[PDB]
Amino acid sequence: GCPRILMRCKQDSDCLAGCVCGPNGFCG
Numbered sequence: 001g002c003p004r005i006l007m008r009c010k011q012d013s014d015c016l017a018g019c020v021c022g023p024n025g026f027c028g
Contacts, residue, residue, distance in 0.1 A: 003028030 002019035007028075009021030021027045
């Protein structure tokens, strides 16, 4: 799902919704 690192962001668009990005270029 959203957290746990395998949706690798610059932008949350990188991810499945109910997810916002930030960290070491990951979501949730």
